[PDB]
Amino acid sequence: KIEEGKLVIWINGDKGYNGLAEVGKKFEKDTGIKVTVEHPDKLEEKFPQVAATGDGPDIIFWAHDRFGGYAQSGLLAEITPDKAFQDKLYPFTWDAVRYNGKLIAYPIAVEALSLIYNKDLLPNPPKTWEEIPALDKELKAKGKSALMFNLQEPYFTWPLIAADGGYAFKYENGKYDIKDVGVDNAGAKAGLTFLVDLIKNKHMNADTDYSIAEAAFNKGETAMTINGPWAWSNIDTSKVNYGVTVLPTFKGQPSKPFVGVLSAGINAASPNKELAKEFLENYLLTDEGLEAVNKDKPLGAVALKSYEEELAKDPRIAATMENAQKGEIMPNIPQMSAFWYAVRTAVINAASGRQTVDEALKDAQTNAAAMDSDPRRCMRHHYVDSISHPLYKCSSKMVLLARCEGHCSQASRSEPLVSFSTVLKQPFRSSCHCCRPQTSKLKALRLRCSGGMRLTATYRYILSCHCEECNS
Amino acid sequence: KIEEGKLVIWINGDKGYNGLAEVGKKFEKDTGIKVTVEHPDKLEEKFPQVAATGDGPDIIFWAHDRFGGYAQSGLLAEITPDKAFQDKLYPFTWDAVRYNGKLIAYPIAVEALSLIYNKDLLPNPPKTWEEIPALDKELKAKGKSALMFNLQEPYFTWPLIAADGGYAFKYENGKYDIKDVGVDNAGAKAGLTFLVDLIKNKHMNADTDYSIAEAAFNKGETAMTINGPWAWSNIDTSKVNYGVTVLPTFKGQPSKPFVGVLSAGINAASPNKELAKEFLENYLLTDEGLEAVNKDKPLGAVALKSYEEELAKDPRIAATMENAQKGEIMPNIPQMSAFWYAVRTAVINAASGRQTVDEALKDAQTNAAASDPRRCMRHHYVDSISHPLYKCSSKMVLLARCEGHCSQASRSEPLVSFSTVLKQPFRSSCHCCRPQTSKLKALRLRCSGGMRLTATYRYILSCHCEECNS
Amino acid sequence: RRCDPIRISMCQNLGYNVTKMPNLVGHELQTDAELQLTTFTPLIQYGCSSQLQFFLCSVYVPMCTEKINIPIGPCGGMCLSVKRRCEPVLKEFGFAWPESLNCSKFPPQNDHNHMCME
Amino acid sequence: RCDPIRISMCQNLGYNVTKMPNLVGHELQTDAELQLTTFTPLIQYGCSSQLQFFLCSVYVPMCTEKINIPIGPCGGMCLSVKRRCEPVLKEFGFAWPESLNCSKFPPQNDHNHMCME
């Protein structure tokens, strides 16, 4: 069940799905190819399952971090935009949609944390993190605070940490090196130490969360905060005259927030690859196409340079783009899942004073930084075999077994012994390690053999192997 | 001190060195780059030493088997001929000039064993090995023999052995698998068995050598022989009307002689890699270029298809190419050294009747191994022997001990036991480095306040990986 | 239908090198399983149980053979031996034993009737 | 103490240490390697399996920090190699050299002498 000669697009409900259908109608009005946009619940769960069988949409809309997983399974098709079209979009957005060198989806929008400040309380925001401690003491005299944001989650605290040379995984050549984590190095060390200083200097509370963060700024009880475009709707309701600007510079360097990138990939199972490609390139990615989607619901920042320049007139969107360009693009590898608990554990322990800064980051380096296991070691190998007695014509049963096998890392040797009179010892004193069972348990099996008796067959099931001496 | 902005080429004296200088003059006559061809003594010995320091020639000419050793040291540079130029030469010649995927030299010529037959004694040669026994008894009535060649060396006897599926090392992906020797299999088994049959049927003598081989055919005392192009000059002198043809087919399959390949590689130290590349591709490897070299002294068969087809008009050269295409390309690896004594030992023992065919080849399969630095090998060391309890003067003595990691994976597989009789729960396998052969030793110790006691110990002569329970 | 190779990195070197999706938790593809498996890396690196990694890999990317239809996971014997050691470590770091690793769902033993890995 | 083996072909052996000058007369290892490589055709031919060990035991002999004198091969090895390789030298226009004279080496690894079999 796959559509031929027509398009069907999937996009989340919170996106501008009515606005995309406007472009879908324009494609039908020109090409004579009808476009059906639809917004299922948990589409990111649905997409792997439907695409794996062969069904599913032609195009799929989701953040770039999820596409790395789909691309590995081979569910997305390889896109081919010429050099001319690649220049249309920003260079850094193309890096976000690239798996093993091959481009797998078209970028659309760009999401990133931005410094939101109170224009009334603070007409000119701080360019540097270092001057915030000084700013806070001045506002504490007026019964206010300088900065307040969600300290619990790493996503919000990371920009400060990654500023001086911290990183989750190294992205050096269109590939994320899993055994190259930069949470322990001096760059991330200094950022978190500065963050911890702010907490125990009573400029900030360790147990502040997203609820208290927003509630503080909306009531005008804090001059600044850090949050994405999504929370602008709430800030509008509070009637606090506010502005969005670039994040402050720690030790001269820029803060690196994690960057999401709303992308649009083509399904491999789709027969309408050419049709789908033109819809994204010619129809969607234009000042007319993106405006149609942005008018329904805002994309915020966009990949296309032409329309972005128009939208940047609104200083809020321009601030998001500036934080995105400077920011760290989020890893699309599935080993990123470990990053979240690791930093959230290290930050909370470092904030409360339960653990030091250097210890917490060293534990994060251990717990969530990728070691592979050796294939030729002495290990417990498993297999299936049908048990039957050799000289007895009757039935047999399928049973699980376990055997030891592998190359022991100890060197075998045999050096000659010296025997005197009345002391005739061995000719040689050898050492040799064999892969053998350390622990095992008994097994048995009654065998229903017709025309006879039901006799039992015993064997030892291996629980663990280890290299032990030959003579033992 | 390397030559820059000019070329200098090394090639052996027995090759057509004046003919190559003709092409060297043509390169100077077009490009304005002077080329000095020269033939020093033992250049293959010289080349490693001079290239290692940075000096030496730009281009180097030698058989392909030696280039594997230079390529390992990194003295040869990687050539980059396009698909168009790669089509010009035969496909099998490219395989002969390939070390670890990277092409290291251009092929030129092709040497391989061919069936030489006496046209007077035998106008039409035998296509099959099996009919030779029958042919010999007919010629023995007329006071002659059918076939005689150098049985001692493996190079001459191997074509028969490798016919039915024998091989030295398997070469599957631009790489020789050292742990994949095909001397013991049924293919090599049947060939040597047929060779031994011929010997004890009095069609052939076990103690025939290169001297008797050539001397027999040159005097018209044998109808056939097996030899390369080099021996043609002698046979011309004997005035025996002869012809060179394809080797006979054993059990349907073709005989596989070892193929040498005169190759031309570029030095890594050379700054004139592009200049050198043009000389070999555009100037040398052409019908004009190779004819200039062939005119001075013959290359025989050549890798380039265009000129080879012209040279094939002479049926002798065509026969060499047919045997080369079907033949086995000779390993360029230094592990090949072990192959030669192994087969030469197995052949002589099988020929004399001292050892059987199956045993000789099984020992060749084992001994060929003989190289890894962590293998089970015989280590030497010194230790001062002294008597326990009785304080006595000591002496410094040599000992030999076994040590190393056996390459076999140890296992312990579970056993199925029905009866309650005392059985083993597991049937394990595990190889330990231990002494294979040793000899006893003795040592008197001058103990004052007592007597001269002797200390006995076994000196180890060789080690080998054997089972744990043995 | 035959079986597939193990595409996940951490669960490659085990007693087996072959697996069939969907797995025992509910994932239909291995890319999604790896996305959830890597959250167990602190508990593995901590080392409450030495068999933890094999137990997790037996669930999320189970053994399979083309001689039998059904896949091969761990037993209750393994599950209980791992849960005994690791639940106290989870509880002290603010976590409970998940419903996805319920030892009651797996069979008791490698029986003649059933079959699983110890 | 002793020195490490700088020669390439004589590295992986029963030992990994040597002391100059050697038994032929060379004072440095660079000169020994310069003359050792002339035996490469005889090695490539493969007259004797022990040939390489025998040559390396002479030109770059074993040494120990416990004894003054160096450790070379025995007459038992020499004669076993010479028997096999002299016919190969004769047919390639060579005789057994005076530098590898088996009479110079001791008969066996005795109490008095000491050498490698």
DSSP A313: T
CATH of domain D1-117: 1.10.2000.10
Return the CATH number at A178: 3.40.190.10
> Minimal Cα–Cα distance from A471 to chain C, Å?
26
Determine the residue type at D51.
L
Q: Which of A381, A397, A446 sits opposite C15 (nearest CB)?
A: A381
Q: Are A309 and A318 in contact (CB under 8 A)?
A: no
Question: What strand order describes the sheet that includes B59-63?
Answer: B35-38, B7-10, B59-63, B262-266, B105-107
Query: CB-based contact (8 Å) between C12 and chain A?
Result: yes
Query: CB-based contact (8 Å) between B435 and chain D?
Result: no
β-strands B105-107, B145-147 pairing = unpaired
Determine the Cα–Cα distance for residues C20 and C62; give it in Å rounded to an integer. Answer: 7
Together in a domain, A354 and A409: no
- Tokens 């690894």 locate to D109
Residues 73-112 of A with CB under 8 A from C: 73
Helices and strands (H and E) in chain C: how many: 4, 2
- Tokens 């299922």 locate to A40
> Minimal Cα–Cα distance from B83 to chain D, Å?
35
The residue among B75, B378, B380, B385 with the most chain D CBs within 10 A of its CB, best to mutate, is B380
Contacts of A383 (CB under 8 A, 6+ apart): A400, A401, A402, A403, C16, C65
Return the CATH number at B406: 2.10.90.10
Q: Are A296 and A16 in contact (CB under 8 A)?
A: yes
Q: Are B280 and B106 in contact (CB under 8 A)?
A: yes
Residue of chain B whose alpha carbon sits nearest to that of A441: B425
The residue among D7, D13, D40 with the most chain B CBs within 10 A of its CB, best to mutate, is D40
Residue A382, φ and ψ in degrees, nearest 5? -115, 150
Contacts of C111 (CB under 8 A, 6+ apart): none
CB < 8 Å to B443, chain D = 111
B touches A (3+ CB pairs < 8 Å)? Answer: yes
> Minimal Cα–Cα distance from A399 to chain B, Å?
12
The residue among A458, A462, A471 with the most chain B CBs within 10 A of its CB, best to mutate, is A458
Determine the Cα–Cα distance for residues B203 and B146; give it in Å rounded to an integer. Answer: 8
Determine the Cα–Cα distance for residues A175 and B445; give it in Å rounded to an integer. Answer: 70
Determine the Cα–Cα distance for residues A465 and A438; give it in Å rounded to an integer. Answer: 5
Q: Are A404 and A415 in contact (CB under 8 A)?
A: no
Whether B430 and A465 lie within 8 Å, measured CB to CB: no
From the list A436, A438, A433, the residue with the least C-alpha distance to A469 is: A433
- Tokens 């999706």 locate to C21
Together in a domain, A351 and A219: yes
- Tokens 């929370």 locate to A231
The residue among D38, D56, D64 with the most chain B CBs within 10 A of its CB, best to mutate, is D64
Whether B341 and D116 lie within 8 Å, measured CB to CB: no
Query: CB-based contact (8 Å) between A419 and chain C?
Result: no
Instruction: Give, in order, the Cα–Cα distances in Å from B62 to each of A100, B65, B108, B187.
Output: 43, 8, 10, 32
The full set of domain ranges for chain C reads: 1-118
DSSP B182: B
Lookup: tokens for B357: 């065919």
H-state helical runs in A297-434:
305-311, 315-326, 337-352, 357-367
Together in a domain, A350 and A443: no
Determine the Cα–Cα distance for residues B179 and A152; give it in Å rounded to an integer. Answer: 59
Whether D15 and B377 lie within 8 Å, measured CB to CB: no
What is the CB neighbour count within 10 angstroms for residue B410? 25
A touches D (3+ CB pairs < 8 Å)? Answer: no
Q: Are A172 and A324 in contact (CB under 8 A)?
A: no
Whether A52 and C28 lie within 8 Å, measured CB to CB: yes
Determine the Cα–Cα distance for residues B385 and B328; give it in Å rounded to an integer. Answer: 55
Lookup: tokens for B62: 């030698």
Determine the Cα–Cα distance for residues B45 and A261; give it in Å rounded to an integer. Answer: 63
From the list A150, A261, A152, A136, the residue with the least C-alpha distance to A202 is: A136
3-state SS of chain C: helix, strand, coil percent to 5? 40, 5, 55
β-strands B395-404, A412-416 pairing = antiparallel
Query: CB-based contact (8 Å) between A402 and chain C?
Result: yes
Determine the Cα–Cα distance for residues B319 and B300; give it in Å rounded to an integer. Answer: 10
**Domain boundaries, position B394:** 377-467
Together in a domain, A399 and A343: no
Q: Which of B428, B457, B459 sits opposite A434 (nearest CB)?
A: B428
Determine the Cα–Cα distance for residues A411 and A432; give it in Å rounded to an integer. Answer: 7
Query: Chains touching chain D at 3 or more Cβ pairs under 8 angstroms?
Result: B
Which H helix or E strand runs over B435? strand B431-441
Residue A168, φ and ψ in degrees, nearest 5? -80, -55
CB < 8 Å to B382, chain D = 64, 66-67
Question: What is the assigned CATH class of domain C1-118?
Answer: mainly alpha
Contacts of B46 (CB under 8 A, 6+ apart): B10, B40, B56
What is the CB neighbour count within 10 angstroms for residue C102? 12
List of E strands, A228-326: 242-245, 258-259, 262-266, 301-302
Residue B284, φ and ψ in degrees, nearest 5? -75, -60
C touches B (3+ CB pairs < 8 Å)? Answer: no
Q: Are B374 and D80 in contact (CB under 8 A)?
A: no
Determine the Cα–Cα distance for residues D37 and B103; give it in Å rounded to an integer. Answer: 26
Determine the Cα–Cα distance for residues B465 and B366; give it in Å rounded to an integer. Answer: 12
From the list C15, C104, C26, the residue with the least C-alpha distance to C55 is: C15
Instruction: Give, in order, the Cα–Cα distances in Å from B253 to each of B127, B163, B296, B348.
Output: 11, 6, 37, 24
Q: Are B308 and B290 in contact (CB under 8 A)?
A: no
- Tokens 């060779």 locate to B195
Whether D49 and B367 lie within 8 Å, measured CB to CB: yes
Residue of chain D whose alpha carbon sits nearest to that of B376: D14
> Minimal Cα–Cα distance from C67 to chain A, Å?
8
Instruction: Give, in order, the Cα–Cα distances in Å from A322 to each of A187, A248, A259, A309.
Output: 22, 12, 11, 12
Number of residues written out for chain C = 118
Determine the Cα–Cα distance for residues B297 and B285; give it in Å rounded to an integer. Answer: 16
Together in a domain, A119 and A252: yes
From the list D28, D44, D22, D1, the residue with the least C-alpha distance to D9 is: D44
Lookup: tokens for A115: 């410094």
Determine the residue type at B53.
T
From the list B372, B464, B462, B397, the residue with the least C-alpha distance to D77 is: B462
Query: By CB neighbour count within 10 A (0-12 exposed, 13-18 middle, 19+ buried), where does B354 fall?
Result: exposed
Determine the Cα–Cα distance for residues B405 and B8; give it in Å rounded to an integer. Answer: 48
Whether C35 and A69 lie within 8 Å, measured CB to CB: yes
Determine the residue type at B153.
E
Q: Are A69 and A268 in contact (CB under 8 A)?
A: no
> Minimal Cα–Cα distance from A454 to chain B, Å?
12
Resolution (A): 3.8
Instruction: Give, in order, the Cα–Cα distances in Å from B171 to each of B23, B260, B333, B367, C83.
Output: 35, 16, 11, 20, 52
A133 three-state secondary structure? helix
B touches D (3+ CB pairs < 8 Å)? Answer: yes
Determine the Cα–Cα distance for residues A347 and A360; give it in Å rounded to an integer. Answer: 8
Determine the Cα–Cα distance for residues B66 and B10; give it in Å rounded to an integer. Answer: 15
> Minimal Cα–Cα distance from B132 to chain D, Å?
31
Helices and strands (H and E) in chain B: how many: 16, 27
Q: Which of C32, C41, C65 sits opposite A338 (nearest CB)?
A: C41
What is the CB neighbour count within 10 angstroms for residue A13? 11
CB < 8 Å to B454, chain A = 420-421
Residue of chain D whose alpha carbon sits nearest to that of B153: D45
> Minimal Cα–Cα distance from D45 to chain B, Å?
6
Determine the Cα–Cα distance for residues B194 and A122; give it in Å rounded to an integer. Answer: 102
What is the CB neighbour count within 10 angstroms for residue B32? 8
Query: By CB neighbour count within 10 A (0-12 exposed, 13-18 middle, 19+ buried), where does A390 fall?
Result: exposed
CA angle, D52 as apex, D50 and D57 as ends, to 5°?
Answer: 95
B419 three-state secondary structure? coil
Query: Chains touching chain A at 3 or more Cβ pairs under 8 angstroms?
Result: B, C
Determine the Cα–Cα distance for residues B340 and B317; give it in Å rounded to an integer. Answer: 27
A106 three-state secondary structure? strand
Residue of chain A whose alpha carbon sits nearest to that of B383: A418
From the list B80, B29, B73, the residue with the least C-alpha distance to B54 is: B73
Residue C115, φ and ψ in degrees, nearest 5? -170, 130
Determine the Cα–Cα distance for residues C97 and B192; give it in Å rounded to an integer. Answer: 70
Determine the residue type at B281.
E
H-state helical runs in A201-253:
210-218, 232-237
Q: Tell me how far the alpha carbon of residue A44 is from its chain's centroid.
A: 14
Together in a domain, A411 and A349: no
Q: Are B9 and B37 in contact (CB under 8 A)?
A: yes
Together in a domain, A176 and A250: yes
Query: CB-based contact (8 Å) between C15 and chain A?
Result: yes
Determine the residue type at B296.
D
Lookup: tokens for A106: 């078209």
Contacts of B82 (CB under 8 A, 6+ apart): none
Q: Which of B336, B367, B395 sits opposite D111 (nearest CB)?
A: B395
Q: Are A207 and A354 in contact (CB under 8 A)?
A: no
Whether D44 and B337 lie within 8 Å, measured CB to CB: yes
Query: Chains touching chain C at 3 or more Cβ pairs under 8 angstroms?
Result: A
> Minimal Cα–Cα distance from D3 to chain B, Å?
15
CA angle, B70 as apex, B68 and B72 as ends, to 5°?
Answer: 70
Kindly give the interhelix angle for A357-367 and A337-352, rounded to the nearest 10 degrees: 160
Q: Are A406 and A435 in contact (CB under 8 A)?
A: yes
Whether D37 and B367 lie within 8 Å, measured CB to CB: no
CA angle, B23 as apex, B20 and B25 as ends, to 5°?
Answer: 110
B71 three-state secondary structure? helix
Together in a domain, A238 and A350: yes
CB < 8 Å to A374, chain C = 13
